[PDB]
Design a protein around this ligand. Structure first.
Ligand SMILES: [Ca+2]
Ligand SMILES: [Ca+2]
Ligand SMILES: [Ca+2]
Ligand SMILES: [Ca+2]
Ligand SMILES: [Ca+2]
Ligand SMILES: [Ca+2]
Ligand SMILES: [Ca+2]
Ligand SMILES: [Ca+2]
Ligand SMILES: [Ca+2]
Lengths: 167, 453, 89, 453, 450
């Protein structure tokens, strides 16, 4: 395998959790514990980096799955969750990424942001953009169009009235 | 002029135009200080760590950091970075079967890395047989810059553990050994390394327990431009900070490629020539190699610059650079390491790049033995050509695995030409290099450069 | 039984979920609250509205009738004289 | 004039011109204090630690450090480096098979090491069998300088623990046992040692838990010169701080090699003679072995100095110096340890190195028995000759495994000569050493020392 | 006069001229405090711990420390050492094969060692079978001075754990060599313990404290003294000064006064009593190491008094005081089952009260029943002969017959010779000496050795 990132912020101490769903029924909820952990995973980069042999992770298969896989079916490895860390500055000035987690804020970021996804055909990106719930009057999150949300998420360029992304 | 925006004990006026530390306080840079040996530092006045490295601008300029840090890492633009690799010394596999590997870690950066525990990969052919992490037996307590663990004269450590608490290497089945006998070798690459760094705390000691380099690898890689210098036997890897493209609030200084190479290696410059350890690293005396993106930027930047030299291009964020000193170098002025002398050479000239040129009347032939040539290797022949006439055609005949016959069109001024050939076999046919000139042509800085095989 | 944590911001701001177990306030929530459950056929919601003590004069928990409990617990909207829960009355 | 840049309770005026400690406070050095035993200390005023070791210049000078640190480490210019290495004493081979070893840790530095955890390599021939790190059973709590663990008189601690906790050590296959029967020995070398030092807290008790030596290894090595002394039966390693060559901001004191040896060993000096513990270590009375860098450095520095004395050369960072006391040395003045008397020796002279020389008229021949000699070892012939006439040639005939016959041309003044020969076999031919002189020559300080096998 | 350089709440002048502690404050010494039982303490005014043990100079003198610390260690010039050893009681071996050892930790120093965790070595001859540490089961919670774990009367604790894995010889050939008649010796290499300090709450904590931190410091600035009484053996360390340092203000004391300080001995004018056993210079045998003997001979000729106990103590010497098992003085002690021959007590030239007026020869028939076979012995005595004209020869039966001649000097002269007795069911020991004329004998001793 090879862990891939499509977000905006690096993840340190990456320990992904996946299951072998075998296109119809799960087999094993594999976890990468000690030597498959990625020390750091930068945005739009994979562990290992480009140019290195695939990361190996170390289960029966029945004869029935063999036929179905041979007839118009494919295997996928969905991810249930990934536990990592993130960088926080200090008064002493060091970046401390132990203890800090990317699981405390995930259900906070997720419930207040409107997912926007763009695919260029070769590399995929996912951005979250904050938005406001209708009921709460005290809420003060600004309300902007999708066009402003597209340009502020993928850093396009507004030449005239059309959006240019990497040309 | 007493302001301090970023709180790093350097005034913004002194931080913006040039400064140096005298007796642990910053003073304005004066051009008369270069004769006392002092250096001129320039940095950004909005960031405490200009390069992203653990130590701030004040600590890097004043030298109050780990004493193993190289002196070229004292520039606030160059990042203190351990570049640690694992080189395989021997491979042992025996009887199912058990495989034992001996490794010796190599450091090439500018910072020591205490408590190194590199993660290495065991790959035979595409398949990663096992991803091994270092146990208590195999952890390097120290790794000084440009040194190995275990040090020279010592046997390398053996790597034979699956997991912690005394595990053993073992291939899963007989398939691995069956294809091993076919004639396949095993490579060794490292995916990641983990270590520590030292910071002198308030109690005067050095602590390397609450510190790790992993926190800064991603940050250093994203604000700095990679530069490599290769000396044939030794390799060096540095990182030089550069400003973001479209950023109004970024204040990282702009410097050229030549100046950055001078800064990142502390290579002295005697007016114009640049020497690292007595080995020239001048623009014309070395062969530069770039990746895909780097080549595009320089070519675009060249046409708008009058001098038209690689070393005058402003450094940016993100490029990859490689510098390989040519293995055999002749300049007819101060260096001739070729085992065999060239043919039809005339040193009486004054139109060379540095001192003289070589006027050729006819052709030049050179006989190179394979005794001092590395077998099964790829080489590239390089040199400079000048012809005021611009009316003579030059053809090259090179003997190799495949004979190369190409034509060259000389220009009005000196121009660099590159020709690549591949030779295989130590006990093969003798390598022949032939070049002919229609009239009178000038030669200077002829070199043969080693490349990946 | 189930074990887990909750998240309360700290002095610096970063959410801490390490020492903050849920299981400390379970035997207290079940002892001061009335259990109310609503089922819609597809999914079921469970809420626990607070209720005062019977004979404690120091108990100042507000008194609200069951009609307000359902409106408060599920954020129901009152149209006319009917409680409406996302279309379904 | 109480300025303190480094804030180590020693004003810059004192630290640059010389200072000594009285009543635990620093006072200006005055030349009259020498007779009372007060020593002169000089250090750098821009660093709290001039030498880089865990203790400051004030603590090292005033002695407020661990009481097991030697006196000569109290010099601010001498670091407290513990050089710990293991001693492989015995083998146990029996059933694959099982291996058991007895080892005894050694210290030869200046400061003790608490909680020693050596790492050991079991190398047979090229291959490394296994890397062993110390267990809880083999962690030595204490280790005094110039001492052992276990202390003398106790049997060595066993080495049969493969990994953390304990698993029995075992060769992986029969192949190594096969070549072991041929007569291949097993060697042990120390790749690293991890240990603690000892400081006091704010409450006065020595805490040694969180402090580790592996931090202050890279710093001290790359800031100080390496000095070794071998006394035949023991060895003593010392590291002395030296200034950087090109730094203008470094204010580390510079001292001669002669004074560096005096400080790093606390060697008493009665004018010019140097004594370690009653054994002279003067430049003329001992021979030195250097590496490549120091050899070319020392030769270049001689021609600029008129006296041309090794001990009078400034110490610069990085040099490696080895001092091996002569095993058999005669000076015809106060020492002659050769078992057999020399031939044709005249003590009636006044042109010797110190008092008298040898008035040799003809040849000198010596018979050396093997009773006090080490077989299978290399020795180097050393001595001094004087011939103002510069008209007599001297040839030497030394019997060895290969017969050596070389000619010598002595100079007008005293000159040292070096000759190499190897002795092999205890029950071998007697070693014959003979030298002939055309006329009358002067001889003094004839030395014989043991080298590697 | 109230200056305190070392910050240990003791004024500078008091610590140099002698001080004593009353009402938890430091007061200047007076000779009038002797009759009340107060002690005279003198120390160094520049260091927090004059001796080098973890307790400061004020704490040791005032007694504000752990209460199990001996009375002989309260004096600042005496270190607080927990000398802990391991002794093996019984050996169990059975099926390769397994070995069980019964051990019992012994303490002989001047302080307790909590959480004793010794490391041992199993050797048969040169080779070391294993290096056993103390697991969770084999740790002594408390080890008070002169008290062992397990305490008196309890069976020794077992020891058969090595990692976990049960203790085992690595091969069968060890059994083959053990059956040959070769035993196994157990020796200790180190020991890990903790010391108690009063936390700010008034409680005693022994968790973060440890002794191994404070061993190298105390073993480097102390002179080692051992007192052996055949049954109970004590070890003490006394702080001394550095020979080549002017800043060293450690007070210098003689060997004799240190022995008074180290064991808190009582003085009846000139005689020193340990527990009723005299430890005077002439009544004991001293076995020095090679280093000390060379140094002692140097100051011996430079002193007019010419007594060993008046020699100034210096850092780095070892002393061993060995109380003789058999001693006589013709005044107040005679432990011999059989009396001498031709002995006259009518004299006034003795060392303390009287001497032995011998006219001829003296022979003693010592029974074997009260002597230890397979042990080395040295006989002692003092010879005085103003005439200096009589030669004395000794004929003592032993494993090898010994015949040596002695020339007595004008004054009392100490003589000692080495002999070995082997075999329980061997010949009875015969001791005979002849004198040409009239000689003076006093303080004859018989001593066991290593
Ligand atoms: Ca600033
Ligand atoms: Ca800055
Ligand atoms: Ca030129
Ligand atoms: Ca200072
Ligand atoms: Ca200083
Ligand atoms: Ca002489
Ligand atoms: Ca004191
Ligand atoms: Ca005091
Ligand atoms: Ca008497």
């Amino acid at each position: 395998v090879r862990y891939y990132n499509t977000g905006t912020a690096p993840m340190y101490k990456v320990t992904p959790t996946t299951n072998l769903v075998l296109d119809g029924e799960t087999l094993a909820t594999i976890k990468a514990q000690d030597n498959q952990i990625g020390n750091n995973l930068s945005p739009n980069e994979t562990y290992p980096k480009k140019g290195l042999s695939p990361l190996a992770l170390n289960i029966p298969i029945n004869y029935d799955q063999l036929k179905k896989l041979d007839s118009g079916k494919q295997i996928k490895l969905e991810t249930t969750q990934v536990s990592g860390n993130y960088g926080t500055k200090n008064s002493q000035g060091q970046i401390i990424t132990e203890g800090n987690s990317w699981s405390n804020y995930i259900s906070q970021i997720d419930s207040v942001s409107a997912s926007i996804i763009l695919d260029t055909g070769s590399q995929t990106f996912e951005r979250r953009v904050a938005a406001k719930e209708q009921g709460n009057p005290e809420d003060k999150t600004p309300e902007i169009t999708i066009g402003e949300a597209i340009k502020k998420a993928f850093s396009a360029t507004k030449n005239g009235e059309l959006l240019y992304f990497n040309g | 002029e007493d302001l301090d925006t970023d709180n790093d004990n350097i005034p913004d006026a002194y931080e913006k135009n040039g400064y140096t530390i005298k007796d642990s306080i910053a003073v304005k840079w004066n051009d008369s200080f270069a004769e006392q040996g002092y250096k001129k530092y320039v940095s950004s006045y909005l960031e405490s760590n200009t390069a992203g490295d653990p130590y701030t601008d004040y600590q890097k300029a004043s030298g109050s950091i780990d004493k193993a840090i190289k002196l070229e890492a004292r520039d606030p633009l160059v990042a203190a970075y351990p570049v640690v690799g694992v080189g395989m010394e021997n491979l042992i596999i025996s009887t199912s079967a058990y495989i034992n590997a001996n490794v010796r870690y190599y450091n090439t950066g500018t910072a020591p890395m205490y408590k190194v525990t590199p993660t290495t990969n065991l790959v035979l052919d595409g398949e990663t047989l096992a991803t091994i992490k270092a146990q208590d037996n195999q952890i390097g307590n120290n790794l000084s810059p440009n040194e190995t663990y275990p040090k020279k004269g010592l046997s390398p450590l053996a790597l034979n553990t699956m997991d912690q608490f005394n595990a053993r290497l073992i291939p899963i089945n007989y398939d691995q050994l069956k294809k091993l006998d076919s004639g396949k070798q095993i490579k060794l690459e490292t995916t990641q390394v983990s270590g520590n760094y030292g910071t002198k705390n308030s109690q005067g000691q050095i602590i390397t327990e609450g510190n790790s380099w992993s926190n800064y690898i991603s940050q250093i890689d994203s604000v700095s431009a990679s530069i490599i210098l290769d000396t044939g036997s030794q390799t060096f890897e540095r990182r030089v900070a550069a400003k973001e493209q479209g950023n109004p609030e970024d204040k990282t200084p702009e410097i050229t490629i030549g100046e950055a190479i001078k800064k990142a290696f502390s290579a002295t410059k005697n007016g114009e020539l640049l020497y690292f350890n007595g080995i020239p690293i001048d623009e014309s005396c070395v062969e530069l190699i770039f990746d895909d993106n780097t080549s595009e930027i320089i070519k675009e930047q060249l046409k708008y610059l009058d001098d038209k030299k690689i070393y005058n291009v402003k450094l940016e964020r993100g490029m990859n650079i490689l510098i390989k000193v040519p293995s055999y170098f002749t300049n007819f002025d101060e260096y001739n390491n070729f085992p065999a002398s060239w043919s039809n050479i005339d040193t009486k000239n004054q139109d060379g790049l540095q001192s003289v040129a070589n006027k050729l009347s006819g052709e030049t032939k050179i006989i190179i033995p394979m005794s001092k040539l590395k077998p099964y290797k790829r080489y590239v022949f390089s040199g400079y050509s000048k012809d005021p006439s611009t009316s003579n055609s030059i053809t090259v005949n090179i003997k190799s695995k495949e004979q190369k016959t190409d034509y060259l069109v000389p220009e009005k001024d000196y121009t660099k030409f590159s020709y690549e050939f591949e030779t295989t076999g130590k006990d093969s046919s003798d390598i022949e290099i032939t070049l002919t000139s229609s009239g009178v042509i000038f030669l200077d800085n002829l070199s043969i450069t080693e490349l990946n095989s | 039984q189930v074990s887990g944590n909750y998240g309360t911001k700290n002095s610096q701001g970063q959410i801490i979920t390490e020492g903050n177990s849920w299981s400390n306030y379970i035997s207290q929530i079940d002892s001061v609250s009335a259990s109310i459950i609503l089922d819609t056929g597809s999914q079921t919601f469970e809420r626990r509205v607070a209720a005062k003590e019977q004979g404690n004069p120091e108990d100042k928990t507000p008194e609200i009738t069951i009609g307000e409990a359902i409106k408060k617990a599920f954020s129901a909207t009152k149209n006319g004289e009917l409680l409406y829960f996302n279309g379904i009355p």
